[PDB]
Amino acid sequence: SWDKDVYPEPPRRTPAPSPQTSLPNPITYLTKAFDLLVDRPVTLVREFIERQHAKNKYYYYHREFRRVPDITECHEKDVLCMFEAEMQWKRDYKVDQEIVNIIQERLKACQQREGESHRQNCAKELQQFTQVVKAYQDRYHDLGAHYSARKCLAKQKQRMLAERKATKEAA
Amino acid sequence: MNLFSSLTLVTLILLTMPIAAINFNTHKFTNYPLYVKTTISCAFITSMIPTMMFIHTGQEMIISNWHWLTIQTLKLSLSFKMDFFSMMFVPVALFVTWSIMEFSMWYMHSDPNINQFFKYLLLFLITMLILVTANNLFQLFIGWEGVGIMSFLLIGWWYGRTDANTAALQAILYNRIGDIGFILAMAWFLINLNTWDLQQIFMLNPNDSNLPLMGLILAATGKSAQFGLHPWLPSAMEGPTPVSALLHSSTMVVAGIFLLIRFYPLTENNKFGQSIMLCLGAMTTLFTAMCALTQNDIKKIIAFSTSSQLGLMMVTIGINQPHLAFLHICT
Amino acid sequence: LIRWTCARSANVYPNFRPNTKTSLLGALFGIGPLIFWYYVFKTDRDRKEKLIQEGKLDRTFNISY
Amino acid sequence: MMTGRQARAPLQFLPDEARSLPPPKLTDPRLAYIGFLGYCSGLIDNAIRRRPVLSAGLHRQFLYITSFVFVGYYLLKRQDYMYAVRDHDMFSYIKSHPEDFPEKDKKTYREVFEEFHPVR
Amino acid sequence: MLKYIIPTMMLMPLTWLSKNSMIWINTTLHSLLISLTSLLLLNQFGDNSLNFSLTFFSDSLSTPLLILTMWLLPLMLMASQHHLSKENLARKKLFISMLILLQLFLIMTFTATELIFFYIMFEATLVPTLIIITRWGNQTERLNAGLYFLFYTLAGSLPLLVALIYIQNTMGSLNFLILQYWVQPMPNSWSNTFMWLACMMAFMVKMPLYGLHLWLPKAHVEAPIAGSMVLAAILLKLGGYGMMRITLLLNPITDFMAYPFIMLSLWGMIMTSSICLRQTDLKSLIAYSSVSHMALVIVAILIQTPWSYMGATALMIAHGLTSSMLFCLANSNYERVHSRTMILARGLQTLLPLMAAWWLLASLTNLALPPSINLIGELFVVMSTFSWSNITIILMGLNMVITALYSLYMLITTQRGKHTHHINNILPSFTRENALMSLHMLPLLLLSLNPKIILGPLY
Amino acid sequence: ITKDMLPGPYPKTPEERAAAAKKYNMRVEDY
Amino acid sequence: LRWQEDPEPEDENLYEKNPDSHGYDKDPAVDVWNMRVVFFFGFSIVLVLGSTFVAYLPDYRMQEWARREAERLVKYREAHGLPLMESNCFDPSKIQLPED
Amino acid sequence: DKRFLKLLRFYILLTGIPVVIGITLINVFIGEAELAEIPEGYVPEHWEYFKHPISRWIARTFF
Amino acid sequence: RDHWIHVLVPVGFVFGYYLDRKNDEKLAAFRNKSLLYKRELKPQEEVTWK
């Protein structure tokens, strides 16, 4: 499984079967045939494989990267510090990419799960999507193919000068 | 969930199995056309179960089963969309294709490349069900170019004949002119909506959809043989009769109509695209039915017939009635 | 056939004479469309950059580039 | 450039202070390359006189390898010496003229303002 | 990278100490062993390049070019062993030596940490190529073609030498890893303008750029089959590799210097593809197709967006495989009709069905049939250039029509129609030739399953 | 194949025109 | 007349003297062993084990980690009420601006 | 053509079928790793950060 | 050896691989000194990598 908080799902409200007709639908018979002939042998083979997994347990780990000094507190043309700042920035850029991917998966799952009432019932995921796309655009857009922490810091300083001038001219 | 998605993927994998059989062969067959016909009859029987349990509840889903490639924010996955359109079109295409192949077991019986013929025809069916069950624009483009290339290989079947090779390259020419607009639409959706998946396209719901819908209308003009890009479909009768019956009447030629039906939430809010589709489909259904009044070759008459019906399908998309258009495809 | 394939490729430049007709057709068809598409793409990108830097062009979900 | 440096002691291939420097090892990759040049000279010498190129004159090929390794070892010693003299003069000159080599204020990028150029 | 340079150099004793009938089998075997060893370069990280030493490193741009380069040598040995069978044994060993030496220069051209060493290897690749073309080419015009190939590259690259030595004197280093962090923005001046031109025009010639591409329909055509394979598949891609390295140092001046050259490519791919519609020489048709495909790589590098670099390196690997296979197919018919006229031998599907299927697959990958990596690169470049300007799609889309038009005409002229009556020396396809076609096409179709390894350093 | 059966310059004398028509295997009045 | 020249040698057919020729060499034992070497070290070695090696690359350019790490960070900042991404890549407390 | 295709399928399957059988035997019997938190004081090796056994084998042996 | 020529290129790999390892110890100045991967040494361990 996964984590239900990073991939949110509302609980399933399925309606009860209330058949009015006297003709039996084939879906019940084919579901019973799929349960007997397919799901049980697949479950048996999976339990065999699961026992063979349990006969030797061993683990893999999620690699933690501790924080190193970023590009703002690295000296100019000091490659030993700004190299590590650049590697940290590139890993953060790839992780922010996958954050945008997670919010896109939330948006698409909400749209398909809500069906025709998607335009009302997925305003929250749309708001989260617009927020994270606006943040990713102000953080990483238009840096070019030779992007760096220097390019991103220069874009941030230009945006902060623009915000400061817009605040100053309106006060 | 366990029955629906399983038999959904079983249909497509079952259709891919005789391709592995014809590629992994050594011997002379015990009627490989009978094997492919039995496979497609079994695929129709298999695909009827998800269709019936869609008729029961309206049960739709998406099988995004295999992650393929993440271009920094674009997670292209092998994603099959089981909605109303796939659930209605896959059994109709399988039933028609099963009839076309039992026709072809008699019609193409004197052909010493009959196993190659049934191989190409099954490859067409695999690419078309990739097209109609697709969830993103890249997989739909795979099915799109696949039915274009199998149209090439099946128009130019008797390849020593110069006119068949000429009509096949003509069909490729008009289809790639439509593909200009298809790739234009893909480019617009990636640059302005960061997606090729249809769900994010529908949920973002863009308002400035003049240019991508112009691209999609150009793609449907090329693929469904509308006016300006029409003559490849009467030229396409130069292939064998079951090629014209399966590909060029009922199954391939409705793919541009299917493309504009698939984007109906973007056409039900754009009146300009509706007027363009309406005028273009009316022009096509006038012109092709007028050309059919005086023809003497029977395949040319039925080709202008099916292009006039495609023009009528474009008309009923253009009056913002997409489900009537898809019902008319299945009919 | 050998004579045709030699005439299409090898004998073109030894039987070329730069005169008025060849110069006008080579400068009209050679650097003509280069100038044309240059001014088209330059005007379009000046317009687009002016709309972007002034906050006019809708660049809302544009994060792939 | 350094003609006034090696003018107080002229025509010395390796001076005495060159012995302060570590000599190249016999497994120097440059010296192995010069031995390879000796082997190539031996093969070309057998090829130009229509001899079996690998077979004829193993004594001659071995003297080719030996002579090129022998000359190239002293050439590499003098090379390392002259680059060490170059660096010694550089460092003595920077130490003797501090006013021509000031210590620069290394500013971090929080103060350093670079103009941003968007690629779009 | 020294685990690859030393086996490639040990291929020289492996071909000069071999028995007279074993000099193809041994070199094929051990070059395939080196190509299997090449997969260790896929130790790529999302942040750091695979940095070996002060001299060699390999990022995710150089890694697929290296794997393609080390794969191309056994394929060239299989391709070139038939028509050099009546050759003298010493010249046969010299030909194998020139191929091995060219691979040796290429594998340390793509892994050059420092740019003047990149220049030395990049121009070292001329001399085995020049000797192969001007020595084992078939026709008279191999000498003139070698002259054009030599003197376009040197006239473009001797300003590149002065520009790189100027960067060494100004920045202090020509290490690429240092210049990732010591790059200064290049301001607007005439001095920086000719700095840009001197850094770029060598690679413009090697790609080739339209208007400067005149060496290529002579150098690729007058070469032998191994020469045409290595010229189309690798030696064009040195230009794209070098541009992707050197446009680090050319910002933000490229943002207004690229405007003519992009036009020269965006029009050039319309012209050269159109030239492919009227080429009677089939090998020249494949040559102008190579120009038309590398025009997109030039456009994508000059707009310098991430999608453009991903699509451009995918297009480089994909075009290397596809163009190498198309030259090998043209050779497979040249070894049966002894002419390169495309209209001469016709109807070859009636006689050679499986070889016609290899022609079919190479033509479908030539026209960028999805989901091939041809289409992945083509499509991603078209996406990035739609982001650049919304009108370029016209010049893209019409190209994707014309690229289809000659890709199937080549299939219809040669393989389809009525067979030529008087040509009766059309042998059945050898196992060697179909092995050559399959070793081109099966890696190309397997890379559609996992294309992330051929998408460059910014996947 | 030889040199005087390959295409050459533009014929300006009538005997060179006749040699050209003999080369291209067609009549001089048709050439 | 012109000089003393050998005439054009005719095109040889490998299938005449070796009807089982694979096209690698005119000696049949050398030809069949060349076929075995090409097919074993080309297909059995490089293609099959190459596809197995590329299929099981250890998280090629750390994308999978980058999903899992993002699945950590979102899980930290959904519950703690933080926004999912800041528009500032670096902390504005550690950036000095040119005064004007 | 048929001889080339029989040789092609044979020399592909000659190591393809052992690789498929071996990968199935790894996925059943050796089995796939489970994600765990890093213990305090434990420094994992670089090949212990990958999930499949063949990926761990490549990161331990070659990379 | 009857087949001594098939060990020129593999040993040329192995020896070459050796030289790569031989160069790694010449580039080991920041071993266990990077700000990201520095750590206390585990018992019975002298270097973090070789």
Ligand SMILES: CCCCCCCCCCCCCCCCCC(=O)OC[C@H](COP(=O)([O-])OCC(O)COP(=O)([O-])OC[C@@H](COC(=O)CCCCCCCCCCCCCCCCC)OC(=O)CCCCCCCCCCCCCCCCC)OC(=O)CCCCCCCCCCCCCCCCC
């Ligand atoms: C079979 C021979 C085939 C031919 C062989 C030769 C082929 C040619 C040469 C190939 C050379 C190798 C090339 C490189 C490949 C390297 C391997 C690799 O990359 O693997 C990747 C990938 C991952 O492998 P992995 O990383 O090792 O495993 C990851 C797991 O997390 C960890 O693994 P796990 O432990 O979770 O996995 C468990 C698995 C072991 O793991 C595997 O087997 C996985 C490895 C298989 C690799 C196969 C690769 C060969 C290619 C196969 C596909 C093409 C075949 C030919 C064409 C067929 C027609 C298309 O256990 C089983 O297999 C047992 C379950 C059996 C279920 C069925 C029977 C149940 C009822 C039995 C009733 C009777 C008993 C009742 C009582 C029982 C009491 C005890 O493996 C596969 O892709 C496996 C193939 C099946 C995938 C799904 C197929 C269906 C998909 C359908 C929807 C999508 C397509 C839609 C198409 C639409 C129209 C176009």
Ligand SMILES: CCCCCCCCCCCCCCCCCC(=O)OC[C@H](COP(=O)([O-])OC[C@H](O)COP(=O)([O-])OC[C@H](COC(=O)CCCCCCCCCCCCCCCCC)OC(=O)CCCCCCCCCCCCCCCCC)OC(=O)CCCCCCCCCCCCCCCCC
């Ligand atoms: C990692 C494990 C992977 C395992 C699975 C492998 C997946 C496939 C890989 C590539 C396969 C290529 C090999 C077949 C074609 C070349 C040889 C040939 O023609 O043989 C004919 C021969 C059978 O015909 P024949 O009657 O004997 O002689 C031919 C006639 O003379 C007259 O010939 P013909 O013209 O009548 O027949 C040729 C016909 C002609 O038909 C066509 O040309 C039409 C095809 C294009 C339109 C339809 C497809 C459009 C795209 C949709 C499919 C892709 C997406 C689907 C996914 C879902 C939606 C996203 O083509 C076919 O029948 C091939 C069917 C499959 C086509 C795949 C797409 C190729 C199109 C070009 C590129 C398109 C983009 C890239 C796609 C990459 C897919 C992996 O086949 C064989 O003998 C097969 C030998 C064994 C082949 C092994 C292939 C893999 C080798 C890799 C080794 C290392 C990895 C281990 C895995 C080993 C697996 C066994």
Ligand SMILES: CCCCCCCCCCCCCCCCCC(=O)OC[C@H](COP(=O)([O-])OCC[N+](C)(C)C)OC(=O)CCCCCCCCCCCCCCCCC
């Ligand atoms: C006849 C033989 C049949 C197979 C016999 C052996 C199996 C027997 C049956 C038991 C099942 C075995 C276990 C289950 C299989 C493995 C499950 C698993 O986790 O697999 C790992 C994964 C699952 O995906 P994933 O997300 O875990 O991994 C993707 C890898 N990353 C994340 C790095 C991107 O791969 C597969 O399952 C591979 C097979 C996929 C099936 C479809 C292939 C289609 C190929 C199309 C190519 C071109 C497409 C281009 C367009 C794409 C769309 C845009």
Ligand SMILES: CCCCCCCCCCCCCCCCCC(=O)OC[C@H](COP(=O)([O-])OCC[N+](C)(C)C)OC(=O)CCCCCCCCCCCCCCCCC
């Ligand atoms: C394949 C054929 C085409 C090849 C084209 C090759 C590129 C085209 C342009 C090349 C220009 C020459 C090299 C420039 C190197 C610049 C390095 C540099 O630092 O520049 C700044 C320097 C500036 O000097 P500086 O850098 O010392 O100045 C200090 C800085 N300021 C300016 C602030 C004081 O530029 C120059 O000094 C001159 C640059 C122009 C040189 C003009 C002479 C050559 C003319 C063109 C020849 C082109 C190829 C000829 C052959 C064609 C085929 C036969």
Ligand SMILES: CCCCCCCCCCCCCCCCCC(=O)OC[C@H](COP(=O)([O-])OCC[N+](C)(C)C)OC(=O)CCCCCCCCCCCCCCCCC
């Ligand atoms: C690389 C640059 C240079 C280029 C030249 C290279 C020359 C050297 C060549 C060496 C060998 C080849 C190297 C590249 C190998 C690429 C392949 C590879 O490894 O793939 C990994 C991919 C990995 O997929 P993945 O991305 O899901 O990875 C899953 C990751 N693991 C396994 C760890 C969980 O392998 C597969 O996808 C295998 C899936 C099963 C087999 C395939 C099933 C689908 C295929 C099509 C079947 C039919 C469909 C319908 C068709 C109907 C008719 C049209």
